[PDB]
Coordinates of N, CA and C in Angstrom, one line a residue:
Chain A
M1 N 112.1 110.4 118.5 CA 111.7 111.8 118.1 C 111.3 111.7 116.6
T2 N 112.1 111.0 115.8 CA 111.9 110.8 114.3 C 111.1 109.6 114.0
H3 N 110.0 109.8 113.3 CA 109.0 108.7 113.1 C 109.2 108.1 111.7
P4 N 109.5 106.7 111.5 CA 109.6 106.1 110.2 C 108.3 105.5 109.7
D5 N 107.8 106.1 108.6 CA 106.6 105.5 107.9 C 107.0 104.7 106.7
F6 N 108.3 104.4 106.7 CA 109.0 103.7 105.6 C 109.8 102.5 106.1
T7 N 109.5 101.4 105.5 CA 110.3 100.1 105.8 C 110.9 99.6 104.5
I8 N 112.2 99.2 104.6 CA 112.9 98.6 103.4 C 113.2 97.1 103.7
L9 N 112.9 96.3 102.6 CA 113.2 94.9 102.6 C 114.3 94.7 101.6
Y10 N 115.4 94.0 102.1 CA 116.6 93.8 101.3 C 116.5 92.6 100.4
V11 N 116.6 92.8 99.1 CA 116.5 91.8 98.0 C 117.8 91.6 97.3
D12 N 117.9 90.5 96.5 CA 119.2 90.2 95.8 C 119.1 90.7 94.3
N13 N 118.1 90.2 93.5 CA 117.9 90.5 92.1 C 116.7 91.4 91.9
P14 N 117.0 92.8 91.9 CA 115.9 93.8 91.8 C 114.7 93.5 90.7
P15 N 115.0 93.2 89.4 CA 113.9 92.9 88.4 C 112.8 91.9 88.9
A16 N 113.3 90.7 89.3 CA 112.4 89.6 89.6 C 111.7 89.8 90.9
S17 N 112.4 90.4 91.9 CA 112.0 90.6 93.2 C 111.0 91.8 93.3
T18 N 111.1 92.8 92.4 CA 110.2 94.0 92.3 C 108.9 93.7 91.7
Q19 N 108.9 92.8 90.7 CA 107.7 92.3 90.0 C 106.9 91.4 91.0
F20 N 107.7 90.7 91.8 CA 107.2 89.8 92.8 C 106.4 90.6 93.8
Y21 N 106.9 91.7 94.4 CA 106.2 92.6 95.3 C 105.1 93.3 94.6
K22 N 105.2 93.5 93.3 CA 104.1 94.2 92.5 C 102.8 93.5 92.7
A23 N 102.8 92.2 92.4 CA 101.6 91.3 92.5 C 101.3 90.9 94.0
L24 N 102.4 90.8 94.8 CA 102.3 90.3 96.2 C 101.5 91.3 97.1
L25 N 101.9 92.6 97.0 CA 101.2 93.6 97.7 C 100.0 94.1 96.9
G26 N 100.2 94.3 95.6 CA 99.2 94.8 94.7 C 99.5 96.3 94.4
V27 N 100.8 96.6 94.2 CA 101.3 98.0 94.0 C 102.2 98.0 92.8
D28 N 102.6 99.2 92.3 CA 103.6 99.5 91.3 C 104.7 100.4 91.8
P29 N 106.0 100.1 91.5 CA 107.2 101.0 91.9 C 107.1 102.4 91.3
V30 N 106.8 103.4 92.2 CA 106.7 104.8 91.8 C 108.2 105.3 91.4
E31 N 109.1 104.8 92.2 CA 110.6 105.0 92.0 C 111.2 103.6 91.8
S32 N 112.3 103.6 90.9 CA 113.0 102.4 90.6 C 114.4 102.8 90.1
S33 N 115.4 101.8 90.3 CA 116.8 102.0 89.9 C 117.4 100.6 89.5
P34 N 118.5 100.5 88.7 CA 119.1 99.2 88.4 C 119.4 98.3 89.6
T35 N 119.6 98.9 90.8 CA 120.0 98.2 92.0 C 119.0 98.5 93.2
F36 N 117.9 99.1 92.9 CA 116.9 99.6 94.0 C 115.5 99.7 93.4
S37 N 114.5 99.7 94.3 CA 113.1 100.0 94.0 C 112.4 100.6 95.2
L38 N 111.3 101.3 94.9 CA 110.5 102.0 95.9 C 109.0 102.1 95.4
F39 N 108.1 101.7 96.2 CA 106.6 101.8 96.0 C 106.0 102.3 97.3
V40 N 105.0 103.3 97.2 CA 104.3 103.9 98.3 C 102.8 103.5 98.3
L41 N 102.3 103.0 99.4 CA 101.0 102.3 99.5 C 99.9 103.3 99.8
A42 N 98.7 103.1 99.3 CA 97.5 103.9 99.6 C 97.1 103.8 101.1
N43 N 97.7 102.9 101.8 CA 97.6 102.7 103.3 C 98.1 103.9 104.1
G44 N 99.0 104.7 103.4 CA 99.7 105.8 104.0 C 101.1 105.4 104.6
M45 N 101.6 104.2 104.1 CA 102.9 103.7 104.4 C 103.8 103.7 103.2
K46 N 105.1 103.4 103.3 CA 106.1 103.4 102.3 C 107.0 102.2 102.4
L47 N 107.3 101.6 101.2 CA 108.0 100.3 101.2 C 109.1 100.3 100.1
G48 N 110.4 100.0 100.5 CA 111.5 99.9 99.6 C 112.0 98.5 99.4
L49 N 112.7 98.3 98.3 CA 113.5 97.1 98.0 C 114.9 97.6 97.7
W50 N 115.8 97.3 98.7 CA 117.3 97.7 98.6 C 118.1 96.5 98.3
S51 N 118.8 96.5 97.2 CA 119.6 95.3 96.9 C 120.8 95.2 97.8
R52 N 121.0 93.9 98.4 CA 122.0 93.6 99.4 C 123.4 93.8 99.0
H53 N 123.7 93.8 97.6 CA 125.0 94.0 97.1 C 125.5 95.4 97.1
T54 N 124.5 96.4 97.4 CA 124.8 97.8 97.4 C 124.2 98.4 98.7
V55 N 123.8 97.6 99.7 CA 123.3 98.1 101.0 C 124.5 98.6 101.9
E56 N 124.3 99.7 102.7 CA 125.2 100.2 103.6 C 124.6 100.3 105.0
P57 N 125.2 99.6 106.1 CA 126.4 98.7 106.0 C 126.2 97.4 105.1
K58 N 127.2 97.1 104.4 CA 127.2 95.9 103.4 C 127.1 94.6 104.2
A59 N 126.0 93.9 103.8 CA 125.6 92.6 104.5 C 125.1 91.6 103.4
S60 N 125.8 90.5 103.2 CA 125.4 89.5 102.3 C 124.6 88.5 103.1
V61 N 123.3 88.7 103.3 CA 122.3 87.9 104.0 C 121.0 87.9 103.3
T62 N 120.3 86.8 103.4 CA 118.9 86.7 102.9 C 118.1 85.8 103.9
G63 N 117.0 86.3 104.6 CA 116.2 85.5 105.5 C 116.7 85.7 107.0
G64 N 117.7 86.5 107.2 CA 118.2 86.8 108.6 C 117.2 87.6 109.4
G65 N 116.5 88.5 108.8 CA 115.4 89.2 109.4 C 114.5 90.0 108.5
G66 N 113.8 91.0 109.0 CA 112.9 91.8 108.2 C 111.6 91.1 108.1
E67 N 110.5 91.6 108.7 CA 109.2 90.9 108.8 C 108.2 91.9 108.3
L68 N 107.3 91.5 107.3 CA 106.3 92.3 106.7 C 105.0 91.8 107.1
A69 N 104.3 92.5 108.0 CA 103.0 92.0 108.5 C 101.8 92.4 107.7
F70 N 101.2 91.5 107.0 CA 100.0 91.7 106.2 C 98.8 91.5 107.0
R71 N 98.1 92.6 107.4 CA 96.9 92.6 108.2 C 95.6 92.3 107.4
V72 N 94.9 91.4 107.9 CA 93.6 91.0 107.3 C 92.5 90.9 108.4
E73 N 91.2 91.0 107.9 CA 90.0 91.1 108.8 C 89.8 89.8 109.6
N74 N 90.1 88.6 109.1 CA 90.0 87.3 109.9 C 90.7 86.2 109.2
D75 N 90.6 85.0 109.9 CA 91.5 83.8 109.7 C 91.4 83.2 108.3
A76 N 90.2 83.4 107.6 CA 89.9 82.9 106.3 C 90.7 83.7 105.3
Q77 N 90.8 85.0 105.5 CA 91.6 85.9 104.6 C 93.1 85.7 104.7
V78 N 93.5 85.0 105.8 CA 94.9 84.6 106.0 C 95.2 83.4 105.0
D79 N 94.2 82.5 105.0 CA 94.3 81.2 104.2 C 94.2 81.5 102.7
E80 N 93.4 82.6 102.3 CA 93.3 83.0 100.9 C 94.7 83.5 100.4
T81 N 95.3 84.4 101.3 CA 96.6 84.9 101.1 C 97.7 83.8 101.0
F82 N 97.5 82.8 101.8 CA 98.4 81.6 101.9 C 98.5 80.9 100.5
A83 N 97.3 80.5 100.0 CA 97.2 79.7 98.8 C 97.6 80.5 97.5
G84 N 97.2 81.8 97.5 CA 97.6 82.7 96.4 C 99.1 82.9 96.2
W85 N 99.8 83.1 97.3 CA 101.3 83.2 97.3 C 101.9 81.8 96.9
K86 N 101.3 80.7 97.4 CA 101.8 79.4 97.1 C 101.8 79.1 95.6
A87 N 100.7 79.5 95.0 CA 100.4 79.3 93.5 C 101.3 80.3 92.7
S88 N 101.7 81.4 93.4 CA 102.5 82.5 92.8 C 104.0 82.3 93.0
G89 N 104.4 81.2 93.6 CA 105.8 80.7 93.7 C 106.6 81.2 94.9
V90 N 105.9 81.3 96.1 CA 106.6 81.5 97.4 C 107.1 80.2 97.9
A91 N 108.3 80.3 98.6 CA 108.9 79.1 99.2 C 108.0 78.4 100.3
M92 N 107.6 79.3 101.3 CA 106.5 78.9 102.2 C 107.0 77.8 103.2
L93 N 107.7 78.2 104.3 CA 108.1 77.2 105.4 C 107.6 77.7 106.7
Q94 N 106.4 77.4 107.1 CA 105.7 77.7 108.3 C 104.3 77.2 108.3
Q95 N 103.8 76.7 109.4 CA 102.4 76.3 109.6 C 101.6 77.5 110.0
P96 N 100.5 77.9 109.3 CA 99.6 78.9 109.7 C 98.8 78.4 111.0
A97 N 99.2 78.9 112.2 CA 98.7 78.4 113.5 C 98.2 79.5 114.4
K98 N 97.2 79.1 115.2 CA 96.6 80.0 116.2 C 97.6 80.4 117.3
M99 N 98.1 81.6 117.3 CA 99.1 82.1 118.3 C 98.3 83.0 119.3
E100 N 98.9 83.4 120.4 CA 98.3 84.3 121.4 C 97.8 85.6 120.8
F101 N 98.5 86.1 119.8 CA 98.1 87.4 119.1 C 97.1 87.2 118.0
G102 N 96.7 85.9 117.8 CA 95.7 85.6 116.7 C 96.2 84.6 115.8
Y103 N 95.5 84.3 114.7 CA 95.8 83.3 113.7 C 97.0 83.9 112.8
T104 N 98.2 83.4 113.0 CA 99.4 84.0 112.4 C 99.9 83.0 111.3
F105 N 100.5 83.5 110.3 CA 101.1 82.8 109.2 C 102.3 83.6 108.7
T106 N 103.4 82.9 108.4 CA 104.6 83.6 107.9 C 105.2 82.8 106.7
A107 N 105.5 83.5 105.6 CA 106.0 82.9 104.4 C 107.5 83.3 104.3
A108 N 108.2 82.7 103.3 CA 109.5 83.1 102.8 C 109.5 83.1 101.3
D109 N 109.8 84.2 100.7 CA 109.9 84.3 99.2 C 111.3 83.8 98.7
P110 N 111.5 83.8 97.4 CA 112.9 83.5 96.8 C 114.1 84.2 97.5
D111 N 113.9 85.5 97.9 CA 114.9 86.3 98.6 C 114.8 86.1 100.1
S112 N 113.7 85.4 100.6 CA 113.5 85.0 102.0 C 113.3 86.2 102.9
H113 N 112.1 86.7 103.0 CA 111.7 87.7 104.0 C 110.5 87.1 104.8
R114 N 110.4 87.4 106.1 CA 109.4 86.8 106.9 C 108.0 87.6 106.7
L115 N 107.2 87.0 105.7 CA 106.0 87.7 105.3 C 104.8 87.2 106.2
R116 N 104.5 88.0 107.2 CA 103.6 87.6 108.4 C 102.1 88.1 108.2
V117 N 101.3 87.2 107.6 CA 99.9 87.4 107.5 C 99.2 86.9 108.8
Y118 N 98.5 87.8 109.5 CA 97.8 87.4 110.8 C 96.3 87.9 110.8
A119 N 95.6 87.3 111.7 CA 94.2 87.7 112.1 C 94.2 87.9 113.6
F120 N 94.1 89.2 114.0 CA 94.2 89.5 115.4 C 93.0 89.0 116.2
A121 N 93.3 88.3 117.3 CA 92.2 87.9 118.3 C 91.9 89.0 119.3
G122 N 90.8 89.7 119.1 CA 90.4 90.8 120.0 C 88.9 91.0 119.8
Chain B
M1 N 98.0 91.3 96.2 CA 96.6 91.7 96.4 C 96.5 92.3 97.9
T2 N 97.2 91.6 98.9 CA 97.1 92.0 100.3 C 98.2 93.0 100.6
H3 N 97.8 94.2 101.1 CA 98.7 95.3 101.4 C 99.1 95.4 102.8
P4 N 100.4 95.3 103.2 CA 101.0 95.4 104.5 C 101.3 96.9 104.9
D5 N 100.5 97.4 105.9 CA 100.8 98.8 106.5 C 101.6 98.6 107.8
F6 N 102.0 97.4 108.1 CA 102.5 96.9 109.3 C 103.9 96.2 109.0
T7 N 104.9 96.7 109.7 CA 106.3 96.1 109.7 C 106.7 95.8 111.1
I8 N 107.3 94.6 111.3 CA 107.8 94.1 112.6 C 109.3 94.0 112.6
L9 N 109.9 94.5 113.7 CA 111.4 94.4 113.9 C 111.6 93.4 115.1
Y10 N 112.4 92.4 114.8 CA 112.7 91.3 115.7 C 113.7 91.7 116.8
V11 N 113.3 91.8 118.1 CA 114.2 92.2 119.2 C 114.4 91.0 120.1
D12 N 115.4 91.1 121.1 CA 115.8 90.0 122.0 C 115.1 90.2 123.3
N13 N 115.3 91.3 124.0 CA 114.8 91.6 125.4 C 113.7 92.7 125.3
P14 N 112.4 92.3 125.2 CA 111.2 93.2 125.0 C 111.3 94.5 125.9
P15 N 111.4 94.5 127.3 CA 111.4 95.7 128.2 C 112.3 96.8 127.7
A16 N 113.6 96.5 127.5 CA 114.7 97.5 127.2 C 114.6 98.0 125.8
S17 N 114.2 97.1 124.9 CA 114.1 97.3 123.4 C 112.8 98.1 123.1
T18 N 111.8 98.0 123.9 CA 110.5 98.7 123.7 C 110.5 100.1 124.1
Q19 N 111.2 100.4 125.3 CA 111.5 101.7 125.8 C 112.4 102.5 124.9
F20 N 113.4 101.7 124.2 CA 114.3 102.2 123.3 C 113.6 102.8 122.1
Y21 N 112.6 102.0 121.5 CA 111.8 102.5 120.4 C 110.8 103.6 120.8
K22 N 110.4 103.6 122.1 CA 109.5 104.6 122.6 C 110.1 106.1 122.4
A23 N 111.3 106.3 122.8 CA 112.0 107.5 122.6 C 112.6 107.7 121.2
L24 N 113.0 106.5 120.6 CA 113.6 106.5 119.2 C 112.7 107.1 118.1
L25 N 111.5 106.5 118.1 CA 110.4 107.0 117.2 C 109.7 108.2 117.8
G26 N 109.4 108.1 119.1 CA 108.6 109.1 119.8 C 107.2 108.7 119.9
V27 N 107.0 107.4 120.2 CA 105.7 106.7 120.3 C 105.6 105.9 121.7
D28 N 104.4 105.4 122.0 CA 104.1 104.6 123.2 C 103.4 103.3 122.7
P29 N 103.8 102.1 123.2 CA 103.2 100.8 122.8 C 101.7 100.7 123.2
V30 N 100.8 100.8 122.2 CA 99.3 100.7 122.4 C 99.0 99.2 122.9
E31 N 99.7 98.3 122.3 CA 99.6 96.8 122.8 C 101.0 96.4 123.2
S32 N 101.1 95.5 124.2 CA 102.3 95.0 124.8 C 102.0 93.6 125.4
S33 N 103.1 92.8 125.5 CA 103.0 91.4 126.0 C 104.4 91.1 126.6
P34 N 104.5 90.1 127.6 CA 105.8 89.7 128.2 C 107.0 89.4 127.1
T35 N 106.6 88.9 125.9 CA 107.5 88.6 124.8 C 107.2 89.3 123.5
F36 N 106.4 90.4 123.5 CA 106.0 91.1 122.3 C 105.6 92.6 122.7
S37 N 105.6 93.4 121.6 CA 105.2 94.8 121.7 C 104.6 95.3 120.4
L38 N 103.7 96.3 120.4 CA 103.1 96.9 119.3 C 102.8 98.4 119.6
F39 N 103.2 99.2 118.6 CA 102.8 100.7 118.6 C 102.4 101.1 117.2
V40 N 101.4 101.9 117.1 CA 100.8 102.4 115.8 C 101.1 103.9 115.7
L41 N 101.6 104.3 114.6 CA 102.1 105.7 114.4 C 101.0 106.6 113.8
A42 N 101.0 107.9 114.1 CA 100.1 108.9 113.6 C 100.4 109.2 112.1
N43 N 101.5 108.6 111.6 CA 101.9 108.6 110.1 C 100.8 107.8 109.3
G44 N 100.1 106.9 110.0 CA 99.1 106.0 109.3 C 99.8 104.6 109.0
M45 N 100.9 104.3 109.7 CA 101.6 103.1 109.6 C 101.6 102.3 111.0
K46 N 102.1 101.1 111.0 CA 102.0 100.3 112.2 C 103.4 99.5 112.4
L47 N 103.9 99.4 113.6 CA 105.2 98.9 113.9 C 105.2 98.0 115.1
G48 N 105.7 96.7 114.9 CA 105.8 95.7 116.0 C 107.2 95.5 116.5
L49 N 107.3 94.9 117.7 CA 108.6 94.3 118.2 C 108.3 92.9 118.6
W50 N 108.7 91.9 117.8 CA 108.5 90.5 118.0 C 109.8 89.9 118.6
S51 N 109.8 89.3 119.8 CA 111.0 88.7 120.4 C 111.4 87.4 119.6
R52 N 112.7 87.4 119.2 CA 113.2 86.3 118.3 C 113.1 84.9 119.0
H53 N 113.0 84.8 120.3 CA 113.0 83.6 121.1 C 111.5 82.9 120.9
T54 N 110.6 83.7 120.4 CA 109.2 83.3 120.2 C 108.7 83.5 118.8
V55 N 109.6 83.9 117.9 CA 109.2 84.2 116.4 C 109.0 82.8 115.7
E56 N 108.0 82.9 114.8 CA 107.7 81.7 113.9 C 107.7 82.1 112.4
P57 N 108.7 81.6 111.6 CA 109.6 80.5 111.9 C 110.8 81.0 112.9
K58 N 111.1 80.1 113.9 CA 112.1 80.4 114.9 C 113.5 80.6 114.3
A59 N 114.1 81.8 114.6 CA 115.4 82.3 114.0 C 116.1 83.1 115.1
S60 N 117.2 82.5 115.6 CA 118.1 83.2 116.5 C 119.1 84.0 115.7
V61 N 118.7 85.3 115.3 CA 119.5 86.2 114.6 C 119.3 87.6 115.1
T62 N 120.3 88.5 115.0 CA 120.2 89.9 115.3 C 121.1 90.7 114.3
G63 N 120.5 91.6 113.5 CA 121.3 92.4 112.5 C 121.5 91.7 111.2
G64 N 120.8 90.6 111.0 CA 120.7 89.9 109.7 C 120.0 90.7 108.6
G65 N 118.9 91.4 109.0 CA 118.1 92.2 108.1 C 117.1 93.0 108.9
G66 N 116.1 93.5 108.1 CA 115.1 94.4 108.7 C 115.6 95.9 108.7
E67 N 115.1 96.7 107.9 CA 115.6 98.1 107.7 C 114.4 99.1 108.0
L68 N 114.6 100.1 108.8 CA 113.6 101.0 109.2 C 114.0 102.4 108.7
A69 N 113.4 102.9 107.6 CA 113.8 104.1 107.0 C 113.1 105.3 107.6
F70 N 113.8 106.1 108.3 CA 113.4 107.4 109.0 C 113.5 108.5 107.9
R71 N 112.4 109.0 107.4 CA 112.4 110.0 106.4 C 112.4 111.4 107.0
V72 N 113.3 112.3 106.6 CA 113.4 113.7 107.0 C 113.5 114.6 105.8
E73 N 113.2 115.9 106.1 CA 113.1 116.9 105.1 C 114.4 117.2 104.3
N74 N 115.6 117.1 105.1 CA 116.9 117.4 104.5 C 118.1 116.9 105.3
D75 N 119.3 117.1 104.8 CA 120.5 116.4 105.2 C 120.9 116.8 106.7
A76 N 120.5 118.0 107.1 CA 120.8 118.5 108.5 C 120.0 117.7 109.5
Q77 N 118.7 117.4 109.2 CA 117.8 116.6 110.0 C 118.2 115.2 110.2
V78 N 119.1 114.7 109.2 CA 119.7 113.4 109.3 C 120.8 113.4 110.4
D79 N 121.5 114.5 110.4 CA 122.7 114.7 111.4 C 122.2 115.0 112.8
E80 N 121.0 115.6 112.9 CA 120.3 115.8 114.2 C 119.9 114.4 114.8
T81 N 119.3 113.6 114.0 CA 118.9 112.2 114.3 C 120.1 111.3 114.6
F82 N 121.3 111.6 113.9 CA 122.5 110.9 114.1 C 123.0 111.0 115.6
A83 N 123.2 112.3 116.0 CA 123.8 112.7 117.3 C 122.9 112.4 118.5
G84 N 121.6 112.5 118.2 CA 120.5 112.2 119.2 C 120.5 110.7 119.6
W85 N 120.6 109.8 118.6 CA 120.7 108.4 118.8 C 122.0 108.0 119.5
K86 N 123.1 108.7 119.1 CA 124.4 108.4 119.6 C 124.5 108.7 121.1
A87 N 123.9 109.8 121.5 CA 123.8 110.2 122.9 C 122.8 109.3 123.7
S88 N 121.9 108.7 123.0 CA 120.8 107.8 123.5 C 121.3 106.3 123.6
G89 N 122.5 106.0 123.1 CA 123.1 104.7 123.3 C 122.9 103.7 122.2
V90 N 123.0 104.2 120.9 CA 122.9 103.4 119.7 C 124.4 103.0 119.4
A91 N 124.6 101.7 118.8 CA 125.9 101.2 118.5 C 126.6 102.0 117.4
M92 N 125.8 102.3 116.3 CA 126.2 103.2 115.2 C 127.4 102.8 114.5
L93 N 127.3 101.9 113.5 CA 128.5 101.5 112.6 C 128.1 101.8 111.1
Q94 N 128.3 103.0 110.6 CA 128.1 103.4 109.3 C 128.4 104.9 109.2
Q95 N 129.0 105.3 108.1 CA 129.3 106.8 107.8 C 128.1 107.4 107.0
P96 N 127.4 108.4 107.6 CA 126.3 109.2 106.9 C 126.9 109.8 105.6
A97 N 126.6 109.2 104.5 CA 127.3 109.6 103.2 C 126.2 109.9 102.1
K98 N 126.6 110.8 101.2 CA 125.8 111.1 100.0 C 125.7 110.0 99.0
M99 N 124.6 109.3 99.0 CA 124.3 108.2 98.0 C 123.5 108.7 96.8
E100 N 123.3 107.9 95.8 CA 122.5 108.2 94.6 C 121.1 108.6 94.9
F101 N 120.5 108.0 96.0 CA 119.1 108.2 96.4 C 119.0 109.4 97.4
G102 N 120.2 110.0 97.8 CA 120.3 111.1 98.7 C 121.2 110.9 99.8
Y103 N 121.2 111.8 100.8 CA 122.1 111.7 102.0 C 121.6 110.6 102.9
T104 N 122.2 109.5 102.9 CA 121.7 108.3 103.7 C 122.6 108.0 104.9
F105 N 122.0 107.5 105.9 CA 122.7 107.1 107.2 C 122.0 105.9 107.7
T106 N 122.7 105.0 108.3 CA 122.1 103.7 108.8 C 122.8 103.4 110.2
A107 N 122.0 103.2 111.2 CA 122.5 102.9 112.5 C 122.2 101.4 112.9
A108 N 122.8 100.9 114.0 CA 122.5 99.6 114.5 C 122.3 99.8 116.0
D109 N 121.2 99.5 116.6 CA 120.8 99.5 118.0 C 121.5 98.3 118.7
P110 N 121.3 98.2 120.1 CA 121.7 97.0 120.9 C 121.3 95.6 120.3
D111 N 120.0 95.6 119.7 CA 119.5 94.4 119.1 C 119.8 94.3 117.6
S112 N 120.4 95.4 117.1 CA 121.0 95.6 115.7 C 119.9 95.4 114.6
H113 N 119.3 96.6 114.3 CA 118.4 96.7 113.1 C 119.0 97.9 112.3
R114 N 118.9 97.8 111.0 CA 119.4 98.8 110.1 C 118.5 100.0 110.0
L115 N 118.7 101.0 110.9 CA 117.9 102.2 111.1 C 118.3 103.3 110.1
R116 N 117.6 103.4 108.9 CA 118.1 104.1 107.8 C 117.5 105.5 107.7
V117 N 118.2 106.6 108.2 CA 117.8 108.0 108.1 C 118.3 108.6 106.8
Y118 N 117.4 109.0 105.9 CA 117.9 109.6 104.6 C 117.3 110.9 104.3
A119 N 117.9 111.7 103.4 CA 117.4 112.9 102.8 C 117.4 112.7 101.3
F120 N 116.2 112.6 100.7 CA 116.1 112.3 99.3 C 116.5 113.4 98.4
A121 N 117.5 113.2 97.5 CA 117.9 114.2 96.5 C 117.0 114.2 95.3
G122 N 116.0 115.0 95.3 CA 114.9 115.1 94.3 C 113.6 115.5 94.9

C-alpha cells in the first residue's frame, strides 16, 4: 500500500563516498550530515547514503547486498559507463555479459555496492 | 554522469517474494521471469527483484544490505505501515524510534531487506 520512491545505499566513510556518488550519478547532496547524505534525482527518484556505523538495525556489512541499476539506451552506453567508473577508481569485479534481460554489467565501489548498468533486450 | 532511477532488491524465491512486494508497495510486476521480476511505480521510479541464485556477481546473502525507504507524510503513517506489514507476515526486528532525520522504522521481510519507513522532521 505504501510506495517507496527512495532507495538507500549503506556506506562506511560519508565524505569520500558522497563525493564518489556526486560524480558517479552526476548529482549533488541536497541534504547531508556528519554520518549521512541525501540527493534527489531529476528522474523523479530519491537516493540516500546511510553510514553503516549508525544504521538501524545495526549491521557491519559492505557488499552483502543493495543493487543500483543504471539504465542506458544500449550496449555501447554500458561500456562507456564501464570505462568511466574504472578510470574514476571503482573496484570492478564482473564481466559485462549478454544476459537474458539484456547486456548487463555490475561494478563494486570502495564501499562495495552492486552497481548494475544494463541495456534491455526488447 | 549516468543516473539510476532503478533499484533492485535481491530475493531467494521469486513467486512468494514478488506477490509479497505486490501488496507491500501496492504494485503489479509489468515484467516477470522464472528467476526475476520487475515493477515500475507511478512515483516515476523503477524496482526489480533479482533472485540471488542467478545474480552476477554471484552472492548467497539475505539481509546483508539493500534498503528501501518508504516515505510518508508523518509519524502516524509510519505506525500504520508498521502494523499492516506485521499482520501481512513481515519478520520485523527494529523499534520505530525518533532519529535525527525523523521518526524512522526499518523492517525485515522473509528474504530480509531493510524496509525503512520514515517521517522526516523538517
